[PDB]
């Protein structure tokens, strides 16, 4: 019975369509709460926090958006956060993308589904607070999101449901980010994460 | 020639009964003709499944893996998610208000 | 309680001793006040009563 | 999300004129896109019009 209990905890392909149409896609939030939009204007970047509920190899990041014009050197960055408010660091870098500017689509309010396969997966454990960063140069891209009207928090590990950085150097993300060099924010993009494009990749021990 | 123990007529019957009983508890069907190689093999399979039951219980004991959309504190849960908030209700004199939740 | 009337402030209450909630338990949280009208963020559902 | 015996199906709705029959059907879907098939019929209801 313990062996079967451990196998049920290893099902990755049991996530509801409201969270992402792929079998294994999680959201930072679900598609059913979408309300309005956020935009990636050069010299600023939008940061979305999430907590990994179940350990997984993250292999496919996804979002809904529009604005496949003016862009060169679009980048995704991922970093792993400090568990405590009081610490002067916010988090340590885990992933840099290559330039993904060619992957982008969409020209109207319904947007387009778009995706990024990590050329090697990232191992995230249960309870891990990740931060997803979106960066672009030339024009501005747009992402479906939530007008997430909330008060800033003075005690919890993260000050508000996302953040934004006034970044100077889009070609080079810091190895580390501080509590000080980032600003807490309400309007956040939906960020999706999946194991891979297809059914399978549930672990089943021999 | 040596008299047995625990029901065995001989020490050969005693040891065979002990080994056959352990293997019959692991495999579930009562049987005979087990060896000490079965004893090691089948105890290694239980030990592995039991250790995985321990790891399963550890995962079910994580309190600290709730998304910030449910509350910014790493343990917070709540009766609704923050991304479905709309409008308000007022706690006011003479009429208290009740929120239900399931744990 | 939070010293503003803007659209939100974060309020918190540590129990002097925890309460032992159990899986599948159904709990009710009641809120009471005197001398004013505390406004809580919530949801209006437009939901019918179930019998 | 979790294995269960499905036993009761719910909705919130309105409409009670003209309708001579209502049917709910349940299908088990193929776990892939690129094959020709959507899914296999699990369940056909009796006429649900009384509900």
From TrEMBL, chain D:
Protein name: Minor tail protein
First-to-last residue of the parent protein present: 259 to 309 of 617
